[PDB]
Symmetry: D2
Subunit: 461 residues, 4 copies
């Protein structure tokens, strides 16, 4: 028996706000979830085409995963990373032996609790292995929020600072803010992508020049997102291979941050696998457990594992390897494999492409779309001017009025159809569902977006 | 039907080592746990007087906590922090209204997933609230391992660097290591009484004051402390904690009490700071927050700090922050703590442990000093002849040393013969803890095993 | 009587080496100088077409400057900046009223002892005035060697680190070597590509970087109008485009005129070729023509009015040194009265015509550009049409000088009694006094012709 | 014929202010100098017992130095460091072979143009030699104003920030302002009687804590400790044992010691260098000020034989345009030769002893003199309220310049002493920093001390 009015009162009074001022905040309670739906206390069913934060890959509240979690709870309990469990060892084995079994670069795994912790771990490993201080990142990359992970995050809207309520006058970034260099993203220098007289993209060419300017001996790693998640982009095809090749030639590591693109999200097990290359280190979260319980991970190459194995590593994280979280990881990955959700993701993405083609034929406010599996971006433009409504685009901050932001207006309208859809960036949709989402829910969501776009293209906002 | 030989094989092969080289590593599989016990696949029962990392406050595998997690799983699922749930709101209400209800400084709570995430959050909030860059920490403090939390960690043995196997030749800290000042710990400037100036002030505090004055108070956001150093294994002189509270107030600087370890009954109060009649501006939480049932951390901020943050849109997202199933575990953990009155149980067992340690010190000249409260104890170990620590670098040691040279390692190995896990992180100092509800029989059994280990240490046969 | 053999022994034994190891070092004593010549103890006259470090603008040992220094020494002595002198006030007046009299942005001057100190001062003022921490520099910029000036220096061959003797094995940068961002130099992205909103890709990306961090985080962009040590010339539109972009984003522009200032480029300052005005200028070299150590910063009226409202807690013992100020006064008065700016402009036109003839004759000249008495000549392999030294401006000094084209050219030209070459391996940096005679220009150019014949013969390989 | 009014107008309008707002600023012109005197345009003679910034060691406008500068100007001109000259090589030989000839440790010299550049150079060298990033400094150290030298300066009143005019309102430090650790001053940890606290083996607690600090970060992270043997701008003298205890601590930890001798060097303390009072030898010395007695801008670093041998094995990729400037080097040579031939080190030592006697007599007469100490021509005098025995300005060495000068005892003293045509005072609010030329006459010491006596009569009346 739940008093949801009291829940709302406690939520307003006792919880720190994010993205909303206390003044403007309206709690949105969710009582339960199932599949691709969120259920409100009043029983409203909301189709979630955010998939929360593109992180509930298996679907909400999967009975096999929950059954597995309950089973672990007959035995545990808690032990820290110094102790071995069946669940922890099995999860590592599934990742190296079963999912990555076709590639021979992967060596070992470290489990932590979050994607930010995974990136922190990867940054530490890369710097220790090379004995070099600098890490290269890209414009608009999001790699997490904790101190180290934030240093490689280049989105001024997502760096844990403060903005005003529909005002430009009360903004601040955190005082004090690094061993980090910002390179151009894949989406710079366009309008197609410019290459030199060698076919090398100008973003990569300049990335190479930056490393050489500092000296390769000063640079541990380039950390990337194969597709920018929060920053909401897709790369030209040759970018990922060219970065892999450039790093190899300069003797610098490449960390593929797969926290979002990992575990079937893009229609392969990992984002990088679309590109015929292999990373030195992968960071993991989100689909690692499909958010059933908090888990993150890093996978390091055999070379890197062999180096770390020769040393005593002075690093403790209390909940790293948590055996109940590991049981949840095991079950999540087993279901993913047995149901062949990767191939299902691939097929559903192809279906989504067709739906978006029709939406673009119909709606001139769709400037561009791209993606794969259950990860899509849709660039929104003024249908008249052919330019984005919000000039600062991906360099915006949240001090703007939401009623001026296209992705906000699309979200509010789509909501009238009982659909959750939109994006983090002001001019770009970021669309994701569970890997096992049904065609009918795809149709429902696309129809809702259709309805929102009519409204956007109508003015009246 | 679990093949534990194959589990050990996968564990060696596929998991990154910490503290042990692959060469020297032997997996120690634990098949299940209960109360104060770990159970091996063979069925051996191990009395855990580390309480893992002093973080299973309620006891292992509490039936009511586990039943509550099972219930949550009927409904969830996962929503991120933008969505409200009963479990998340209730957990915040329990902390603010029930546990801290008698104090009026607390305003609001932010939940995250780990103690390190909680410290990161507190550092961000302190700097934003004050609009100032610098944070003061102390020598030997441990506040976590992630970037920002690590900058305020002043233990060179726990900064996620590398050392060799029984060698000084393969030592490295992470390249690139800044907005932090290290002040003396409370355990500095002695006779063996703590030195004070002509007013009340401890020299550790007076110098901390001079340090902040040297940079300028307008540059300094906060002092972050542990009321009792956890990994660093110390206890303060009584006046330290009130004197730091008063100093920070006088300078217009915040105080963050990092209660990740000392929180939720560990010290025989709800919070460590509560022994000292003061209140902080911000508290960081983990460990006993959920008693390790599921991953959770949190920050509590004062009413003034909440009011300021409330006026702004805060551009911070953590995917698993507020995870509804973790919040369910937190609610159940806290309600069992309250209803069983585990805080009082911890206070009483602490008084009991004190008397057991007095008897052990009488028996053992290798016990130089011991101190603590509730289920958090330090025991400083000395060479019984020379009366000096065996390991000279003490709390400034690193793990390159041979464990056969380390008193707390020797003690741990020997105690293990009695089926008891007990020892410490520091080379010369035990860090002892159990569940808040640890029985007297288990205390006696742990203390007997320590007695036994100390005979061996003192025999010099090692 | 000077025992020059004893001087060499003392020089070997007691002075720290730079650029040469003790093992390879051979002292090069200079007994006196005059005009464009250096005179050895033996009486050999060497024509100096490096003009030392493009810093003896007025010419060596000007009789009027030396006579003015001698007069000042009848009165001083030394007073620090708190005390006023005629020489310090007059040097400030000459700069603001006389030299920059035709421009209305200049406000006040601060005198220091060197160009690095001038840059440190400008960085301090920029960050204080804007209350912002970040400063933007460019790839291959040189702005000095002291801590702050070094942070904006982006040449890995000039950051006060160490390299081996003809070896790659003993190289290090200073440990620790920071509120600075590196943008592309003007010589990136080529013939230069444009946004066709008109914007050079170098400027476009610089803009993006500032927007990505947030313009409210960025105090200034510091540039060289022509990269000195780094040895380049910009596309014509670059300097006006950077001025326009910084103004639009509310960011300061510091023109580092330590090298290009005081007639070097055939105008009083390099920026004056481009119809723009900076917010802050930094000065050294031609400020006194190296007669005595002096540097300076000039800040705009707005900046001066802000600084004037505060008590500035900055002391430099020798800043404003009355005798160095007497030297600056005499140096600037001679420059003005002899019309050396116009003379430099006319000699540069002459040099251009000499270089066109050498390029027509020497396929190892891939390219040249410059103005006044500041010229770059890019050298290439006449056969492949590409540079001999692949790392180019990202090299370090560990390589063998017998592999370096500008070292080859220098050794060869010395056989003609001419000092000429460059800091960069593939690029000449040529400078003489503003009053260098046509005869001496012909003599240097003839030595260069001779040197390129040798380079093109490939005998040194 | 100089128009001094026009000079003062150009000065007001076209020069950036330091320490004074434009609103409050009044130019103080000096037409010429001689010995220990500054001469105003009107012909007022001011006895300068600041010796500018304790940096005109030989005296103002020395005839032999000026003649040597004029001789150099018959030949030069300018050559950068890549070229050898007689003046540069001779200056290095004088330092290593003549001045420091009785010590075995010194190897080589690098000349630069300022003390801040010398400190920048020492920090670079210590970090390169050890291959470690951290340098340790102390509370209230002043090591210069440029980016690297500023990181090891721990006086918030001298870090090139901004404060308001007679207000706490409008203050700022430079945005963005680390591979530096701050250790306690030698002047920390005193008991009630003002005695320095030590452990039972006599080790000062300031040193004991410094060692703990280094051990906490790890000695393998720490390149160097940089010190001032006597804090200059920060205006202190150390407990006697501090300097040897730091030398011994650094040696035991494998860490370098940089003695920043920019102020204490070249006879200032009645020895060639401040460290020489203490029976120790540093790894690196930084020099400025008395190096040329400010005749022209010059700075230098001296490195040990072992550091020089390491540096000699590499190509060092570092250029400073004016480093080694031959005319500046000719001034250094003449400055050092005069110092040696006149035996100015001994003169300074004996004059310090005379000064001590005058200060003892002043302290009997004036209860506002809480303490004094020093040596040679470098003295501190701590000023207290004669009635409370407590400093007037509570923040003391951690003050900033936003304070009203009419509340600052060292400002009140300077203003009063000026009535007697003596310049005397200090940078810190409760502490005089007194210096004159090494060859200052007894009569001038008497004149300065009589002005101080006068000023303290006024301070002690409380009328201000
Ligand atoms: C969401 C995200 C992270 C951080 O994960 P958390 O679990 O939110 O801390 C890191 N990297 C990428 C690419 C992400 O999308
Ligand atoms: C263990 C600990 C932390 C870090 O918590 P984690 O959950 O391990 O990230 C922070 N502070 C203190 C005092 C701790 O004991
Ligand atoms: C030479 C130079 C400097 C530094 O001047 P120094 O007098 O060597 O300290 C600064 N900026 C530029 C552009 C330079 O060429
Ligand atoms: C004055 C001083 C400096 C800085 O020298 P400048 O010539 O002013 O740059 C450095 N160290 C000490 C001890 C000083 O007194
Ligand atoms: Cl990309
Ligand atoms: Cl403490
Ligand atoms: Cl350029
Ligand atoms: Cl001292």
């Amino acid at each position: 028996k739940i008093n949801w009015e009291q829940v709302k009162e406690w939520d307003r009074k006792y919880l720190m706000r994010t993205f909303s001022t206390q003044n403007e905040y309206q709690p949105v309670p969710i009582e339960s979830t199932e599949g691709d739906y969120l259920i409100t206390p009043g029983g409203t069913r909301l189709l979630d085409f955010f998939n929360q934060l593109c992180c509930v890959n298996l679907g909400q509240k999967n009975q096999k995963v929950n059954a597995a979690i309950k089973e672990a709870l007959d035995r545990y309990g808690f032990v820290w990373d110094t102790y071995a469990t069946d669940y922890k060892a099995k999860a590592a084995k599934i990742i190296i032996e079963d999912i990555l079994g076709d590639e021979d670069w992967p060596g070992k795994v470290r489990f932590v609790s979050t994607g930010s912790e995974a990136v922190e771990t990867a940054l530490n490993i890369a710097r220790l292995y090379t004995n070099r201080p600098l890490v290269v990142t890209r414009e608009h990359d999001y790699h997490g929020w904790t101190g180290g992970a934030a240093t490689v995050t280049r989105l001024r809207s997502f760096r844990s600072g403060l903005v005003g309520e529909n005002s430009e006058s009360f903004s601040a970034q955190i005082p004090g803010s690094s061993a980090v260099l910002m390179a151009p993203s894949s989406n710079t220098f366009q309008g197609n992508y410019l290459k030199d007289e060698n076919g090398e993209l100008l973003s990569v060419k300049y990335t190479r020049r930056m490393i050489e300017n500092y000296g390769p001996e000063q640079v541990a790693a380039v950390i990337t997102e194969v597709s920018q998640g929060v920053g909401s982009t897709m790369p030209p095809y040759e970018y990922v291979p060219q970065i892999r090749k450039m790093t190899k030639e300069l003797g610098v590591l490449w960390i593929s941050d797969e926290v979002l693109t990992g575990f079937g999200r893009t229609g392969k097990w990992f984002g990088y696998q679309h590109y015929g290359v292999q990373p030195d280190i992968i960071t993991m979260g989100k689909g690692l457990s499909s958010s059933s319980l908090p888990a993150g991970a890093v996978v390091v190459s055999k070379e890197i594992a062999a180096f770390m194995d020769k040393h005593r590593w002075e690093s403790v994280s209390t909940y790293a390897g948590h055996p109940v979280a590991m049981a949840a990881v095991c079950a999540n990955l087993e279901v993913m494999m047995e149901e062949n959700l990767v191939e299902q993701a691939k097929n559903s993405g192809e279906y989504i492409r067709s739906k978006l083609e029709l939406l673009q034929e119909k709606h001139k406010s769709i400037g561009n779309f791209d993606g794969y599996g259950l990860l899509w971006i849709v660039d929104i433009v003024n249908a008249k001017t052919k330019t984005p409504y919000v000039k600062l685009d991906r360099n915006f901050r949240h001090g703007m009025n939401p009623n001026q932001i296209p992705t906000q207006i699309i979200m509010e309208k789509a909501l009238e159809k009982g659909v959750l859809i939109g994006g983090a960036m002001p001019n770009t949709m970021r669309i994701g569902a569970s890997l096992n989402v049904s065609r009918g829910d795809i149709d429902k969501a696309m129809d809702a977006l259709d309805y929102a776009l009519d409204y956007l293209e109508s003015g009246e906002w």
